[PDB]
Write a protein that holds these residues in place. Structure first.
Motif, PDB file in Angstrom:
ATOM      1  N   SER B  59      49.172  40.959  33.426  1.00  0.00           N
ATOM      2  CA  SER B  59      47.878  41.747  32.669  1.00  0.00           C
ATOM      3  C   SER B  59      48.109  42.342  31.675  1.00  0.00           C
ATOM      4  O   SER B  59      49.352  42.713  31.258  1.00  0.00           O
ATOM      5  CB  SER B  59      47.497  42.472  34.009  1.00  0.00           C
ATOM      6  N   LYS B  60      47.000  42.635  30.954  1.00  0.00           N
ATOM      7  CA  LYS B  60      47.060  43.413  29.432  1.00  0.00           C
ATOM      8  C   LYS B  60      47.323  44.879  29.785  1.00  0.00           C
ATOM      9  O   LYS B  60      46.929  45.380  30.792  1.00  0.00           O
ATOM     10  CB  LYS B  60      45.893  43.017  28.907  1.00  0.00           C
ATOM     11  N   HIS B  61      47.659  45.612  28.877  1.00  0.00           N
ATOM     12  CA  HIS B  61      47.584  47.055  28.826  1.00  0.00           C
ATOM     13  C   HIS B  61      46.391  47.498  29.281  1.00  0.00           C
ATOM     14  O   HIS B  61      45.343  47.201  28.731  1.00  0.00           O
ATOM     15  CB  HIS B  61      48.218  47.664  27.551  1.00  0.00           C
ATOM     16  N   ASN B  62      46.334  48.649  30.142  1.00  0.00           N
ATOM     17  CA  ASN B  62      44.910  49.413  30.379  1.00  0.00           C
ATOM     18  C   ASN B  62      43.996  48.687  31.460  1.00  0.00           C
ATOM     19  O   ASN B  62      42.999  49.219  31.530  1.00  0.00           O
ATOM     20  CB  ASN B  62      44.347  50.010  29.331  1.00  0.00           C
ATOM     21  N   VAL B  63      44.534  47.636  31.942  1.00  0.00           N
ATOM     22  CA  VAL B  63      43.804  46.973  32.944  1.00  0.00           C
ATOM     23  C   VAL B  63      44.054  47.790  34.330  1.00  0.00           C
ATOM     24  O   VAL B  63      45.096  47.897  34.697  1.00  0.00           O
ATOM     25  CB  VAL B  63      44.533  45.376  33.268  1.00  0.00           C
ATOM     26  N   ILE B  64      43.039  47.797  35.176  1.00  0.00           N
ATOM     27  CA  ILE B  64      43.018  47.968  36.512  1.00  0.00           C
ATOM     28  C   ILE B  64      42.816  46.680  37.381  1.00  0.00           C
ATOM     29  O   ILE B  64      41.525  46.273  36.923  1.00  0.00           O
ATOM     30  CB  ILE B  64      42.474  49.412  37.085  1.00  0.00           C
ATOM     31  N   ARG B  65      43.286  46.499  38.192  1.00  0.00           N
ATOM     32  CA  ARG B  65      42.824  45.474  39.348  1.00  0.00           C
ATOM     33  C   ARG B  65      42.851  46.119  40.594  1.00  0.00           C
ATOM     34  O   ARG B  65      43.779  46.594  41.045  1.00  0.00           O
ATOM     35  CB  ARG B  65      43.801  44.330  39.160  1.00  0.00           C
ATOM     36  N   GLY B  66      41.839  45.917  41.179  1.00  0.00           N
ATOM     37  CA  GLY B  66      41.440  46.671  42.636  1.00  0.00           C
ATOM     38  C   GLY B  66      40.144  47.515  42.794  1.00  0.00           C
ATOM     39  O   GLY B  66      39.375  47.593  41.896  1.00  0.00           O
ATOM     40  N   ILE B  67      39.985  48.160  43.877  1.00  0.00           N
ATOM     41  CA  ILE B  67      40.876  48.280  45.035  1.00  0.00           C
ATOM     42  C   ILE B  67      40.502  47.163  46.067  1.00  0.00           C
ATOM     43  O   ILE B  67      39.174  47.012  46.402  1.00  0.00           O
ATOM     44  CB  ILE B  67      40.891  49.689  45.628  1.00  0.00           C
ATOM     45  N   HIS B  68      41.397  46.262  46.238  1.00  0.00           N
ATOM     46  CA  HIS B  68      41.266  44.914  46.929  1.00  0.00           C
ATOM     47  C   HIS B  68      41.798  44.937  48.324  1.00  0.00           C
ATOM     48  O   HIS B  68      43.040  45.471  48.458  1.00  0.00           O
ATOM     49  CB  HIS B  68      41.689  43.867  46.362  1.00  0.00           C
ATOM     50  N   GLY B  69      41.155  44.639  49.489  1.00  0.00           N
ATOM     51  CA  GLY B  69      42.200  44.408  50.732  1.00  0.00           C
ATOM     52  C   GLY B  69      41.117  43.288  51.533  1.00  0.00           C
ATOM     53  O   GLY B  69      40.116  43.181  51.304  1.00  0.00           O
ATOM     54  N   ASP B  70      41.598  43.206  52.918  1.00  0.00           N
ATOM     55  CA  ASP B  70      41.207  42.204  53.746  1.00  0.00           C
ATOM     56  C   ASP B  70      41.857  42.628  55.085  1.00  0.00           C
ATOM     57  O   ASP B  70      42.802  43.182  55.188  1.00  0.00           O
ATOM     58  CB  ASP B  70      41.302  40.831  53.265  1.00  0.00           C
ATOM     59  N   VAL B  71      41.062  42.153  56.223  1.00  0.00           N
ATOM     60  CA  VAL B  71      41.603  42.376  57.507  1.00  0.00           C
ATOM     61  C   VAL B  71      42.704  42.006  58.269  1.00  0.00           C
ATOM     62  O   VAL B  71      43.169  42.283  58.874  1.00  0.00           O
ATOM     63  CB  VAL B  71      40.512  42.434  58.502  1.00  0.00           C
ATOM     64  N   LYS B  72      43.209  40.701  57.539  1.00  0.00           N
ATOM     65  CA  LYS B  72      44.403  40.334  57.964  1.00  0.00           C
ATOM     66  C   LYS B  72      45.599  40.220  57.242  1.00  0.00           C
ATOM     67  O   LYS B  72      46.740  39.951  57.800  1.00  0.00           O
ATOM     68  CB  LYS B  72      44.122  38.925  58.410  1.00  0.00           C
ATOM     69  N   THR B  73      45.489  40.339  55.630  1.00  0.00           N
ATOM     70  CA  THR B  73      46.738  40.196  54.918  1.00  0.00           C
ATOM     71  C   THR B  73      47.503  41.373  54.598  1.00  0.00           C
ATOM     72  O   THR B  73      47.221  42.395  54.031  1.00  0.00           O
ATOM     73  CB  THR B  73      46.273  39.404  53.615  1.00  0.00           C
TER      74      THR B  73
END
Ligand SMILES: Nc1nc2c(ncn2[C@@H]2O[C@H](COP(=O)(O)OP(=O)(O)O)[C@@H](O)[C@H]2O)c(=O)[nH]1
Ligand SMILES: Nc1nc2c(ncn2[C@@H]2O[C@H](COP(=O)(O)OP(=O)(O)O)[C@@H](O)[C@H]2O)c(=O)[nH]1
Ligand SMILES: C[N+](C)(C)C
Ligand SMILES: [Cl-]
Ligand SMILES: [Cl-]
Ligand SMILES: [Cl-]
Ligand SMILES: [Cl-]
Lengths: 175, 178
Positions: B59-73
């Motif tokens: 990812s590039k500077h100043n990216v946020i990825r999220g907030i991600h989740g799931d019930v099994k992982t």
């Protein structure tokens, strides 16, 4: 769908050349280097990858040529660019000291499955690189003292490296 | 020669969150280190689960990825080039610690590896000019892709994460969650 293109080397059976797909957008890229379901299947006799390692090296470093009797590897470059080399280091193999070289970077995301008994090496052609490799073996990790070493520029292998003067460990100079 | 080692600590407030610190061999060439062995790390997962999936995010500077989740992982996350702020959030609506979070700064000199439970949200921010984020996934059956996941807003006021920016670079998915 997470995809792998899985090819086998023509000359060096047991060497797999695996290419992932990627999702690319304004943020950069995301991709999968490995799933047990896709890649553990390529190993013999129920073996599984069970170990993940990173090597961060500066420009013009060579690490190699390293291997041992039991360790399978799965190698790629996740930042920058390397020349990735595998060598058949089985003295009694009909293909002993044959080799294959790959220029691995973000635009050529080859992931190389290196058999046990093969030697593994890489050269950093970028300013810096982060090398990723998984290891598959039973029992205890084979550390440096239990490994073989071949010289990067061994005349019998004749690898066409982009350098005549790499930065080397004492191990890799003594070979 | 140097012995491969892990220091394994569990979060005080978010049980199931592990903070794993590897050693490294550092020399004239750079550094070599182990992010994971099955023997050291799979035993932290419940019910015989194993990490079976390796992913990279560049990812590039100043990216946020999220907030991600799931019930099994279950996830095992670190930064193998550059620097991120790594954030975990308890995203279990019926948890006593629902929307509690922990933030870690991860770089080459502070090589934290964070085990994130199933049902937790995951996020990171790229503070370096570029970063490579590495994470392993442990699950049974098919990979849980974007449609299978839940999403919380990076700036959800209930969570109150202290991010370095008010102007993160975001996907449509992560903007939609605001
Ligand atoms: N080829 C490939 N595509 C992916 C991968 N991970 C995510 N994608 C795709 O890229 C998009 C971005 O994923 P994202 O919204 O971050 O969901 P997450 O990556 O599953 O948390 C999704 O719509 C996925 O279809 C991957 O490992 N490989
Ligand atoms: N902490 C740690 N040390 C390692 C690791 N791998 C190798 N080392 C040590 O670093 C030194 C150099 O590693 P070596 O096996 O020669 O591989 P190279 O560094 O790629 O040449 C060895 O003496 C090892 O003891 C690792 O994963 N973690
Ligand atoms: C930590 N564990 C007992 C859930 C495996
Ligand atoms: Cl190696
Ligand atoms: Cl060559
Ligand atoms: Cl995630
Ligand atoms: Cl915070």
């Amino acid at each position: 769908a997470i995809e792998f293109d899985i090819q086998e080397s023509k000359i060096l059976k047991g060497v797999y050349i695996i290419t992932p797909n990627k999702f690319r957008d304004l943020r950069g890229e995301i991709w999968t280097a490995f799933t047990s379901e896709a890649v553990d299947k390529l190993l013999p006799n129920g073996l599984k990858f069970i170990h993940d390692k990173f090597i961060h090296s500066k420009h013009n470093v060579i690490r190699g040529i390293h291997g041992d009797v039991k360790t399978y590897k799965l190698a790629t470059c996740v930042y920058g660019e390397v020349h990735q080399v595998v060598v058949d280091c089985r003295k009694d193999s009909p293909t002993y000291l044959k080799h294959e070289r790959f220029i691995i970077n973000q635009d050529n995301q080859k992931i190389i499955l290196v058999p046990a008994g093969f030697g593994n090496a890489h050269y950093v052609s970028s300013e810096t690189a982060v090398y990723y490799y998984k290891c598959a073996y039973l029992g205890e990790y084979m550390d440096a003292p239990d490994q073989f070493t071949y010289a990067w520029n061994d005349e019998r292998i004749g690898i066409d490296w982009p350098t005549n003067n790499p930065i080397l460990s004492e191990r890799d100079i003594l070979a």
